[PDB]
CSV table of C-alpha atoms and ligand atoms in Angstrom, one decimal:
chain,number,residue,atom,x,y,z
A,2,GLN,CA,0.0,0.0,0.0
A,3,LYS,CA,2.8,2.5,1.1
A,4,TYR,CA,5.3,1.1,-1.6
A,5,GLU,CA,5.0,0.4,-5.4
A,6,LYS,CA,7.3,-2.4,-6.6
A,7,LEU,CA,9.4,-1.4,-9.7
A,8,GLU,CA,11.3,-4.8,-10.3
A,9,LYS,CA,12.8,-7.8,-8.4
A,10,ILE,CA,16.6,-7.2,-7.6
A,11,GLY,CA,17.0,-10.9,-6.5
A,12,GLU,CA,16.3,-13.1,-3.4
A,16,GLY,CA,13.5,-13.1,1.6
A,17,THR,CA,13.2,-11.5,-1.9
A,18,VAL,CA,14.5,-8.0,-2.6
A,19,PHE,CA,12.6,-5.4,-4.8
A,20,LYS,CA,13.4,-1.9,-6.1
A,21,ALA,CA,10.3,0.1,-5.0
A,22,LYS,CA,8.9,3.7,-4.8
A,23,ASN,CA,7.4,5.3,-1.7
A,24,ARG,CA,3.8,6.1,-2.8
A,25,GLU,CA,3.7,9.3,-0.7
A,26,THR,CA,7.2,10.9,-1.1
A,27,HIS,CA,8.1,9.1,-4.5
A,28,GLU,CA,11.7,8.3,-3.2
A,29,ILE,CA,13.3,5.0,-4.6
A,30,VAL,CA,14.2,2.3,-1.9
A,31,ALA,CA,15.0,-1.4,-1.7
A,32,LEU,CA,12.3,-3.6,0.0
A,33,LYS,CA,13.3,-7.0,1.5
A,34,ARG,CA,10.1,-9.1,2.0
A,35,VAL,CA,10.3,-11.8,4.7
A,36,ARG,CA,7.5,-14.4,4.9
A,37,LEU,CA,6.3,-15.1,8.5
A,38,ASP,CA,4.1,-18.2,7.9
A,39,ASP,CA,7.2,-20.4,7.7
A,40,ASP,CA,7.4,-23.3,5.2
A,41,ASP,CA,11.2,-23.7,6.1
A,42,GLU,CA,11.0,-22.6,9.8
A,43,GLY,CA,13.7,-20.1,10.9
A,44,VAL,CA,13.8,-17.2,8.4
A,45,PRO,CA,12.1,-14.6,10.6
A,46,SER,CA,14.6,-15.2,13.5
A,47,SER,CA,17.6,-14.0,11.3
A,48,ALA,CA,15.5,-11.0,10.0
A,49,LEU,CA,14.8,-9.9,13.6
A,50,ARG,CA,18.5,-10.1,14.5
A,51,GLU,CA,19.4,-8.1,11.4
A,52,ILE,CA,16.7,-5.4,12.4
A,53,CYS,CA,18.1,-5.2,16.0
A,54,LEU,CA,21.7,-4.7,14.7
A,55,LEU,CA,21.0,-2.3,11.8
A,56,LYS,CA,18.9,0.0,14.1
A,57,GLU,CA,22.2,0.5,16.0
A,58,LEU,CA,24.6,0.8,13.0
A,59,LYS,CA,24.1,4.2,11.2
A,60,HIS,CA,27.2,4.8,9.0
A,61,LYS,CA,27.5,6.0,5.3
A,62,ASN,CA,29.4,2.6,4.5
A,63,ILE,CA,26.7,0.3,6.2
A,64,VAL,CA,23.4,-0.3,4.2
A,65,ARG,CA,20.8,2.0,5.9
A,66,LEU,CA,17.6,0.4,7.3
A,67,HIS,CA,15.0,3.2,7.1
A,68,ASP,CA,11.9,1.3,8.4
A,69,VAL,CA,10.3,-2.1,9.1
A,70,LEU,CA,6.6,-2.7,8.1
A,71,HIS,CA,4.3,-5.6,9.2
A,72,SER,CA,1.4,-6.2,6.8
A,73,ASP,CA,-0.1,-9.5,5.4
A,74,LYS,CA,1.9,-12.5,6.6
A,75,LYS,CA,5.2,-10.6,5.9
A,76,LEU,CA,7.8,-8.4,7.3
A,77,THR,CA,9.1,-5.6,5.0
A,78,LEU,CA,12.6,-4.2,5.6
A,79,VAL,CA,12.9,-0.8,3.9
A,80,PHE,CA,16.5,-0.1,2.9
A,81,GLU,CA,18.3,2.7,0.9
A,82,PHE,CA,18.5,1.6,-2.8
A,83,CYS,CA,22.0,0.8,-4.2
A,84,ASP,CA,22.7,0.4,-8.0
A,85,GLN,CA,24.4,-3.1,-7.8
A,86,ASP,CA,26.7,-5.4,-5.7
A,87,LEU,CA,30.4,-6.0,-6.2
A,88,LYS,CA,29.7,-9.4,-8.0
A,89,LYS,CA,27.7,-7.6,-10.7
A,90,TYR,CA,30.4,-4.7,-10.8
A,91,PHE,CA,33.1,-7.3,-11.5
A,92,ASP,CA,31.0,-8.8,-14.3
A,93,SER,CA,30.3,-5.3,-15.8
A,94,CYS,CA,34.0,-4.2,-16.0
A,95,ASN,CA,35.7,-7.6,-17.0
A,96,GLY,CA,36.9,-7.9,-13.4
A,97,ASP,CA,39.4,-5.0,-14.3
A,98,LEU,CA,39.4,-2.2,-11.6
A,99,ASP,CA,41.5,1.0,-11.8
A,100,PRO,CA,44.0,1.0,-8.9
A,101,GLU,CA,42.2,4.1,-7.4
A,102,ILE,CA,38.8,2.3,-7.4
A,103,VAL,CA,40.6,-0.7,-5.7
A,104,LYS,CA,41.8,1.7,-2.9
A,105,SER,CA,38.4,3.6,-2.7
A,106,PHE,CA,36.4,0.3,-2.3
A,107,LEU,CA,38.8,-1.2,0.4
A,108,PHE,CA,38.9,2.2,2.2
A,109,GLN,CA,35.0,2.3,2.4
A,110,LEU,CA,34.8,-1.4,3.4
A,111,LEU,CA,37.3,-0.8,6.3
A,112,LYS,CA,35.4,2.4,7.4
A,113,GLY,CA,32.1,0.3,7.6
A,114,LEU,CA,33.8,-2.6,9.2
A,115,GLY,CA,35.7,-0.4,11.7
A,116,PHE,CA,32.4,1.2,12.7
A,117,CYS,CA,30.8,-2.3,13.2
A,118,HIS,CA,33.7,-3.5,15.3
A,119,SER,CA,33.8,-0.3,17.4
A,120,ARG,CA,30.0,-1.0,18.1
A,121,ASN,CA,30.8,-4.6,19.2
A,122,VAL,CA,29.2,-6.2,16.1
A,123,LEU,CA,30.8,-9.1,14.0
A,124,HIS,CA,29.5,-9.2,10.4
A,125,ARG,CA,30.7,-12.8,9.7
A,126,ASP,CA,29.4,-12.9,6.0
A,127,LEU,CA,31.7,-10.5,4.0
A,128,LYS,CA,31.7,-11.5,0.3
A,129,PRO,CA,31.2,-9.5,-2.9
A,130,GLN,CA,27.4,-10.2,-3.0
A,131,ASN,CA,27.1,-8.4,0.4
A,132,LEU,CA,29.0,-5.3,-0.8
A,133,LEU,CA,26.6,-2.8,-2.5
A,134,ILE,CA,28.1,-0.3,-5.1
A,135,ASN,CA,26.5,3.0,-6.3
A,136,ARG,CA,27.4,4.7,-9.7
A,137,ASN,CA,28.9,7.7,-7.7
A,138,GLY,CA,31.5,5.1,-6.3
A,139,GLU,CA,29.9,4.6,-2.8
A,140,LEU,CA,30.3,1.2,-1.2
A,141,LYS,CA,28.0,-0.1,1.6
A,142,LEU,CA,28.4,-3.3,3.7
A,143,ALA,CA,25.0,-5.2,3.6
A,144,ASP,CA,23.3,-8.4,4.9
A,145,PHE,CA,23.6,-8.6,8.7
A,146,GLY,CA,21.6,-11.9,8.7
A,147,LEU,CA,24.7,-13.8,10.1
A,148,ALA,CA,26.0,-10.8,12.2
A,149,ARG,CA,26.1,-10.9,16.0
A,150,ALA,CA,26.8,-8.6,19.0
A,151,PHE,CA,29.8,-9.8,21.0
A,152,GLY,CA,31.1,-9.0,24.5
A,153,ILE,CA,29.3,-11.4,26.9
A,154,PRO,CA,31.8,-14.2,27.6
A,155,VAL,CA,30.4,-17.5,26.1
A,156,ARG,CA,31.7,-21.2,25.7
A,157,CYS,CA,31.7,-20.8,21.8
A,158,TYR,CA,30.2,-19.1,18.8
A,159,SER,CA,29.1,-21.2,15.7
A,160,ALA,CA,32.0,-22.4,13.6
A,161,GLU,CA,29.5,-22.5,10.6
A,162,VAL,CA,30.1,-18.8,9.8
A,163,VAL,CA,31.5,-17.2,6.6
A,164,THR,CA,31.1,-19.1,3.2
A,165,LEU,CA,34.1,-21.5,2.8
A,166,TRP,CA,36.1,-19.2,0.4
A,167,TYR,CA,36.2,-16.3,2.9
A,168,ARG,CA,36.7,-18.3,6.2
A,169,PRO,CA,40.0,-17.8,8.1
A,170,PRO,CA,42.3,-20.7,9.0
A,171,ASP,CA,41.5,-20.5,12.8
A,172,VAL,CA,37.7,-21.1,12.0
A,173,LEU,CA,38.7,-23.8,9.4
A,174,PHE,CA,40.6,-25.5,12.3
A,175,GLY,CA,37.3,-25.4,14.3
A,176,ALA,CA,38.2,-22.5,16.8
A,177,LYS,CA,35.3,-22.2,19.3
A,178,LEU,CA,35.8,-18.4,19.8
A,179,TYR,CA,36.9,-15.6,17.4
A,180,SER,CA,37.0,-11.8,17.5
A,181,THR,CA,36.7,-9.0,14.9
A,182,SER,CA,39.7,-10.8,13.3
A,183,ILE,CA,37.1,-13.1,11.4
A,184,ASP,CA,36.0,-10.1,9.2
A,185,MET,CA,39.6,-8.8,8.7
A,186,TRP,CA,40.5,-12.1,6.9
A,187,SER,CA,37.4,-11.8,4.7
A,188,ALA,CA,38.4,-8.2,3.9
A,189,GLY,CA,41.9,-9.5,2.8
A,190,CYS,CA,40.2,-12.1,0.5
A,191,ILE,CA,38.1,-9.3,-1.1
A,192,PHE,CA,41.1,-6.9,-1.4
A,193,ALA,CA,42.9,-9.8,-3.5
A,194,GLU,CA,39.7,-9.9,-5.8
A,195,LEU,CA,39.6,-6.1,-6.3
A,196,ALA,CA,43.4,-6.1,-7.0
A,197,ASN,CA,43.4,-8.9,-9.6
A,198,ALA,CA,40.4,-9.9,-11.9
A,199,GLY,CA,37.5,-10.2,-9.4
A,200,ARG,CA,38.1,-13.9,-8.9
A,201,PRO,CA,38.2,-15.6,-5.4
A,202,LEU,CA,41.8,-16.0,-4.1
A,203,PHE,CA,41.1,-19.3,-2.3
A,204,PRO,CA,38.3,-21.2,-4.0
A,205,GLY,CA,38.5,-24.5,-2.0
A,206,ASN,CA,36.1,-27.5,-2.6
A,207,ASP,CA,36.0,-28.3,1.2
A,208,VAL,CA,37.8,-27.5,4.5
A,209,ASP,CA,40.9,-29.6,3.7
A,210,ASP,CA,41.3,-28.0,0.2
A,211,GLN,CA,40.6,-24.5,1.6
A,212,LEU,CA,43.5,-24.8,4.2
A,213,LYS,CA,45.9,-26.2,1.5
A,214,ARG,CA,45.2,-23.3,-0.9
A,215,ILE,CA,45.8,-20.7,1.9
A,216,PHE,CA,49.1,-22.4,3.2
A,217,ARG,CA,50.3,-23.0,-0.4
A,218,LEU,CA,50.2,-19.2,-1.1
A,219,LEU,CA,51.1,-17.7,2.4
A,220,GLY,CA,53.3,-20.5,3.8
A,221,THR,CA,52.3,-23.0,6.6
A,222,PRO,CA,52.3,-21.2,10.0
A,223,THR,CA,55.1,-22.4,12.3
A,224,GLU,CA,54.8,-23.1,16.1
A,225,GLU,CA,56.7,-19.8,16.6
A,226,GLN,CA,54.2,-17.8,14.5
A,227,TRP,CA,51.0,-19.6,15.9
A,228,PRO,CA,51.7,-21.6,19.1
A,229,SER,CA,48.0,-22.5,19.8
A,230,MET,CA,47.5,-23.8,16.2
A,231,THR,CA,48.2,-27.5,17.0
A,232,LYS,CA,45.7,-27.4,20.0
A,233,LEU,CA,42.7,-26.3,17.9
A,234,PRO,CA,39.7,-28.7,17.9
A,235,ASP,CA,39.9,-29.8,14.2
A,236,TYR,CA,43.7,-29.3,13.8
A,237,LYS,CA,45.5,-31.8,11.6
A,238,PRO,CA,49.1,-31.7,10.2
A,239,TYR,CA,49.4,-29.9,6.8
A,240,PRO,CA,52.6,-29.9,4.6
A,241,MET,CA,55.0,-27.1,5.5
A,242,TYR,CA,54.7,-24.9,2.4
A,243,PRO,CA,57.4,-22.1,2.2
A,244,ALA,CA,56.8,-18.4,3.3
A,245,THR,CA,58.9,-17.3,0.2
A,246,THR,CA,56.1,-17.5,-2.5
A,247,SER,CA,55.7,-14.1,-4.3
A,248,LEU,CA,52.3,-12.3,-4.1
A,249,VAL,CA,53.2,-9.9,-7.1
A,250,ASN,CA,51.3,-12.0,-9.8
A,251,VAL,CA,48.4,-12.8,-7.4
A,252,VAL,CA,47.7,-9.0,-6.9
A,253,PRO,CA,49.2,-7.2,-10.0
A,254,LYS,CA,47.1,-3.9,-9.3
A,255,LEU,CA,49.1,-3.4,-6.0
A,256,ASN,CA,52.6,-2.0,-5.4
A,257,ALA,CA,54.8,-3.0,-2.3
A,258,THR,CA,52.5,-0.7,-0.1
A,259,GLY,CA,49.3,-2.5,-1.1
A,260,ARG,CA,51.0,-6.0,-0.8
A,261,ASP,CA,52.1,-5.1,2.8
A,262,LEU,CA,48.5,-4.2,3.8
A,263,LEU,CA,47.2,-7.5,2.1
A,264,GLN,CA,49.8,-9.6,4.1
A,265,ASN,CA,48.6,-7.8,7.4
A,266,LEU,CA,45.0,-8.8,6.6
A,267,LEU,CA,45.8,-12.4,5.6
A,268,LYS,CA,47.7,-13.3,8.8
A,269,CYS,CA,46.8,-17.0,9.6
A,270,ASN,CA,47.1,-16.4,13.4
A,271,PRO,CA,44.0,-14.3,14.2
A,272,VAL,CA,45.8,-12.3,17.0
A,273,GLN,CA,48.3,-11.0,14.4
A,274,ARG,CA,45.6,-9.8,11.9
A,275,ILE,CA,45.5,-6.0,11.5
A,276,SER,CA,42.4,-4.3,12.9
A,277,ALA,CA,40.1,-2.1,10.6
A,278,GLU,CA,41.3,1.0,12.7
A,279,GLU,CA,45.0,0.1,12.1
A,280,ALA,CA,44.4,-0.7,8.4
A,281,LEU,CA,42.8,2.8,7.8
A,282,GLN,CA,46.2,4.2,9.2
A,283,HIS,CA,48.3,2.1,6.8
A,284,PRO,CA,50.4,4.1,4.3
A,285,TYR,CA,48.4,2.5,1.4
A,286,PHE,CA,45.7,5.1,2.3
A,287,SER,CA,48.1,8.1,3.0
A,288,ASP,CA,48.0,11.2,0.7
A,289,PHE,CA,51.8,10.4,0.1
A,290,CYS,CA,51.3,6.7,-1.2
A,291,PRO,CA,53.0,5.8,-4.5
B,48,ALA,CA,25.9,-18.2,39.3
B,49,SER,CA,23.7,-21.4,38.7
B,50,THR,CA,21.2,-21.5,35.8
B,51,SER,CA,18.6,-23.0,38.2
B,52,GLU,CA,19.2,-20.1,40.7
B,53,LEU,CA,18.9,-17.3,38.1
B,54,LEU,CA,15.8,-19.0,36.5
B,55,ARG,CA,14.2,-19.0,40.1
B,56,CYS,CA,15.2,-15.3,40.5
B,57,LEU,CA,13.5,-14.6,37.1
B,58,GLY,CA,10.3,-16.5,38.2
B,59,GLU,CA,10.2,-14.7,41.6
B,60,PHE,CA,10.7,-11.3,39.7
B,61,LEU,CA,7.7,-12.1,37.3
B,62,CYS,CA,5.4,-13.1,40.3
B,63,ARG,CA,6.2,-9.7,42.0
B,64,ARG,CA,5.9,-7.6,38.8
B,65,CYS,CA,2.6,-9.2,37.7
B,66,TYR,CA,0.7,-8.5,40.9
B,67,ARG,CA,-2.8,-9.3,39.3
B,68,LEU,CA,-1.8,-13.0,38.7
B,69,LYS,CA,-3.0,-14.5,42.0
B,70,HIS,CA,-2.5,-18.1,40.9
B,71,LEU,CA,0.9,-17.8,39.0
B,72,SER,CA,3.7,-20.0,40.5
B,73,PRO,CA,7.3,-18.8,40.4
B,74,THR,CA,8.0,-22.3,38.9
B,75,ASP,CA,5.6,-21.6,36.0
B,76,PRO,CA,7.9,-19.3,34.0
B,77,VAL,CA,10.8,-21.8,34.6
B,78,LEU,CA,8.6,-24.6,33.3
B,79,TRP,CA,7.6,-22.6,30.1
B,80,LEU,CA,11.3,-21.7,29.4
B,81,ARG,CA,12.8,-25.2,30.1
B,82,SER,CA,10.0,-26.8,27.9
B,83,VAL,CA,11.0,-24.6,24.8
B,84,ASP,CA,14.8,-25.3,25.2
B,85,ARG,CA,14.2,-29.1,25.6
B,86,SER,CA,11.9,-29.2,22.6
B,87,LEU,CA,14.4,-27.3,20.3
B,88,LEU,CA,17.2,-29.7,21.3
B,89,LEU,CA,15.2,-32.9,20.9
B,90,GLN,CA,13.8,-31.7,17.5
B,91,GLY,CA,17.4,-31.0,16.4
B,92,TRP,CA,17.1,-27.2,15.9
B,93,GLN,CA,20.1,-26.8,18.3
B,94,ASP,CA,23.1,-29.0,19.4
B,95,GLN,CA,23.1,-27.6,23.0
B,96,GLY,CA,20.7,-25.8,25.3
B,97,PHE,CA,20.3,-22.0,24.9
B,98,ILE,CA,19.5,-21.4,28.6
B,99,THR,CA,22.8,-20.5,30.3
B,100,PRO,CA,23.5,-18.0,33.1
B,101,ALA,CA,24.5,-15.2,30.6
B,102,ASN,CA,21.3,-15.8,28.5
B,103,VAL,CA,19.0,-15.7,31.5
B,104,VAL,CA,20.5,-12.3,32.5
B,105,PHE,CA,19.9,-11.1,28.9
B,106,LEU,CA,16.2,-12.5,29.0
B,107,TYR,CA,15.7,-10.7,32.4
B,108,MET,CA,17.1,-7.4,30.9
B,109,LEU,CA,14.2,-7.7,28.3
B,110,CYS,CA,11.5,-8.9,30.8
B,111,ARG,CA,12.1,-6.0,33.3
B,112,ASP,CA,11.6,-3.2,30.7
B,113,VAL,CA,8.9,-5.0,28.6
B,114,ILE,CA,6.5,-6.8,31.0
B,115,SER,CA,3.8,-4.6,32.4
B,116,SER,CA,2.8,-4.8,36.1
B,117,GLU,CA,-0.8,-4.7,34.6
B,118,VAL,CA,-0.6,-8.2,32.7
B,119,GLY,CA,-4.1,-9.5,33.1
B,120,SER,CA,-3.7,-13.3,32.8
B,121,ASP,CA,-1.1,-16.0,33.1
B,122,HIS,CA,-1.6,-16.7,29.3
B,123,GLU,CA,-0.7,-13.0,28.5
B,124,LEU,CA,2.4,-13.4,30.7
B,125,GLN,CA,3.5,-16.6,28.9
B,126,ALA,CA,2.9,-14.9,25.5
B,127,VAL,CA,5.0,-11.8,26.4
B,128,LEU,CA,7.7,-14.0,28.1
B,129,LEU,CA,8.0,-16.3,25.0
B,130,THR,CA,8.2,-13.2,22.8
B,131,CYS,CA,11.2,-11.9,24.9
B,132,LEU,CA,12.7,-15.5,24.8
B,133,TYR,CA,12.3,-15.7,20.9
B,134,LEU,CA,14.2,-12.4,20.6
B,135,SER,CA,16.9,-13.7,23.0
B,136,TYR,CA,17.3,-16.9,20.8
B,137,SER,CA,17.3,-14.7,17.7
B,138,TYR,CA,20.0,-12.2,19.0
B,139,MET,CA,22.2,-14.4,21.2
B,140,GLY,CA,21.6,-18.0,19.9
B,141,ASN,CA,24.4,-19.9,18.2
B,142,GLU,CA,22.1,-21.3,15.4
B,143,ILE,CA,21.3,-19.1,12.4
B,144,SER,CA,17.6,-19.5,12.9
B,145,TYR,CA,14.9,-20.9,15.3
B,146,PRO,CA,11.3,-21.9,14.4
B,147,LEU,CA,8.2,-20.0,15.7
B,148,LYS,CA,6.1,-23.0,16.9
B,149,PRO,CA,7.5,-23.5,20.4
B,150,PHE,CA,7.2,-19.7,21.2
B,151,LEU,CA,3.6,-19.2,19.9
B,152,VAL,CA,0.8,-19.6,22.5
B,153,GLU,CA,-1.7,-17.2,20.9
B,154,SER,CA,-4.2,-17.9,18.1
B,155,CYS,CA,-3.5,-14.3,16.6
B,156,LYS,CA,0.0,-14.7,15.0
B,157,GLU,CA,-0.2,-11.0,13.9
B,158,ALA,CA,-0.2,-10.0,17.6
B,159,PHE,CA,3.0,-12.1,18.2
B,160,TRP,CA,4.9,-10.3,15.3
B,161,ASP,CA,3.6,-6.8,16.3
B,162,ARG,CA,5.0,-7.5,19.9
B,163,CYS,CA,8.4,-8.7,18.4
B,164,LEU,CA,8.7,-5.3,16.6
B,165,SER,CA,7.5,-3.3,19.7
B,166,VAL,CA,10.2,-5.0,21.9
B,167,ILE,CA,12.9,-4.5,19.3
B,168,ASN,CA,11.9,-0.7,19.0
B,169,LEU,CA,12.2,-0.4,22.8
B,170,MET,CA,15.2,-2.7,23.6
B,171,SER,CA,17.6,-2.8,20.5
B,172,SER,CA,20.0,-0.3,22.1
B,173,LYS,CA,20.2,-2.2,25.5
B,174,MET,CA,20.5,-5.5,23.7
B,175,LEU,CA,23.8,-4.3,22.1
B,176,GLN,CA,24.9,-2.3,25.3
B,177,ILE,CA,24.7,-5.4,27.6
B,178,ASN,CA,27.2,-7.0,25.1
B,179,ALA,CA,29.4,-3.9,24.5
B,180,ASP,CA,29.5,-2.7,28.2
B,181,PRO,CA,30.6,-5.4,30.8
B,182,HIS,CA,29.8,-2.9,33.6
B,183,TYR,CA,26.1,-2.9,32.4
B,184,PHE,CA,26.1,-6.8,32.2
B,185,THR,CA,27.4,-7.0,35.8
B,186,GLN,CA,24.7,-4.4,37.0
B,187,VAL,CA,21.9,-6.5,35.3
B,188,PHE,CA,23.4,-9.8,36.7
B,189,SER,CA,23.5,-8.3,40.3
B,190,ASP,CA,19.9,-7.0,39.9
B,191,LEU,CA,18.6,-10.5,38.9
B,192,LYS,CA,20.4,-12.1,41.9
B,193,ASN,CA,18.9,-9.5,44.3
B,194,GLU,CA,15.3,-10.4,42.9
B,195,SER,CA,15.3,-13.5,45.3
C,301,LIG,O1,21.3,-7.9,-12.9
C,301,LIG,C1,21.2,-8.9,-11.9
C,301,LIG,C2,21.8,-8.3,-10.6
C,301,LIG,C3,22.9,-8.8,-9.9
C,301,LIG,C4,23.0,-8.0,-8.8
C,301,LIG,N1,22.1,-7.0,-8.8
C,301,LIG,C5,21.8,-6.0,-7.9
C,301,LIG,C6,22.3,-6.1,-6.6
C,301,LIG,C7,22.0,-5.1,-5.7
C,301,LIG,C8,21.1,-4.1,-6.0
C,301,LIG,N2,20.7,-3.1,-5.1
C,301,LIG,C9,20.4,-3.3,-3.7
C,301,LIG,C10,20.4,-4.6,-3.1
C,301,LIG,C11,20.1,-4.7,-1.8
C,301,LIG,N3,20.1,-5.9,-1.1
C,301,LIG,C12,19.9,-6.0,0.2
C,301,LIG,O2,19.9,-7.2,0.8
C,301,LIG,C13,20.5,-8.3,0.2
C,301,LIG,C14,22.0,-8.2,0.2
C,301,LIG,C15,22.6,-9.5,-0.3
C,301,LIG,N4,22.1,-10.7,0.3
C,301,LIG,C16,20.6,-10.8,0.3
C,301,LIG,C17,20.1,-9.5,1.0
C,301,LIG,C18,19.6,-4.8,0.9
C,301,LIG,C19,19.5,-3.6,0.3
C,301,LIG,C20,19.8,-3.5,-1.0
C,301,LIG,C21,19.8,-2.3,-1.7
C,301,LIG,N5,20.1,-2.2,-3.0
C,301,LIG,C22,20.6,-4.0,-7.3
C,301,LIG,F1,19.7,-3.0,-7.6
C,301,LIG,C23,20.9,-5.0,-8.2
C,301,LIG,N6,21.3,-7.2,-10.0
C,302,LIG,CL1,10.9,5.4,2.5
C,303,LIG,CL1,32.8,8.0,-2.9
C,304,LIG,CL1,21.0,-5.9,4.3
C,305,LIG,CL1,51.4,-28.3,10.3
C,306,LIG,CL1,46.1,-34.3,3.7
C,307,LIG,CL1,50.4,-16.1,8.1
C,308,LIG,CL1,-5.8,-14.0,38.2
């Protein structure tokens, strides 16, 4: 009644819509409440609770929530596309300044989430919204959670396999903001090459081999707790000497240093969003 | 610190808050909550029980701001308590999602969903603060203990 649908964006199902009163363009996420597959509403209520408390220009803005028919409608700001479509539209080929702008905005949004005690836990190109003016927003807080109350464990079933860090692949019970910084590193590698996933494993074993094959297998010195993790098993010792130059050809030495700080296997050694924003990659004086 | 102790403290708190409910037992809220957690586990929606000391403190934080002194029937108390419990599972639970069925005791589903959105509008800031601010968590935990 309040909104006219213009077209389906994808799948809840998402629609481009117009406010019937104001005529502003928005994105509507419709969530069915008369569950066929029980559970969907639960994730939508968590997303609403978190986005109510996360108002930042680099986090998708929830304007309103409507309850009509047997459905919940989440009213979001409208964005032109996601990073997946953006890669398809430019042959996966980004200008180095767009690489830098997109990572900068992702880190600002992520930095804001972490400072508010929220883990995103689902960073991937489909969840990064892109506007024609070059704005980037972090979207989809369906797997996000508040942290701070000490607990036995979180779920180890978080992040799609290709964006999941080695501590979580080894079945770590607890993780910090470090989980999202690994995913941010994976996305940086996509921006800085041809928009293809850096570590496209078929399963947990293949995922760990692809990571260690590029970065080197962490030593007992680098990661003393590694061998004690619940699903630890011995991996081959791949050398730490393998060049990153051809894996991220859009990046100079400065960009490669920031990528290595994001892709630290030991979660305690991973750079924070706040530290990453202070990296010389983002200075006015960067080559 | 015991789950049993804090659940008792919650039950005693609800009997004192809801002064119109002359035949409410302080064991009734504990029975309603234990029943939901048991059902979700046995039906395989979760691998472990949700009800822990920290999650009872979180539930109590919701209950004390949401539940009216003027609740008119034990049924209405159960409906509002299970709405706060559903939101606790949704915000703090380790599984991605939880089904509606165990939390629904009303014939009007529309009223359940309206209450979800009302509680979120009131409580979403404190739901994050009790995580972000360990001093606030300790304050709420102390308050629950002092309800006995
Ligand atoms: O041509 C085919 C194609 C491929 C991609 N696009 C496309 C992508 C995004 C937008 N705009 C948009 C999307 C939104 N999505 C939201 O939530 C979803 C996020 C991902 N996980 C599921 C929940 C929230 C708010 C949103 C605001 N704007 C678009 F217009 C087209 N089109
Ligand atoms: Cl609007
Ligand atoms: Cl911009
Ligand atoms: Cl979203
Ligand atoms: Cl090893
Ligand atoms: Cl092997
Ligand atoms: Cl490493
Ligand atoms: Cl009565």
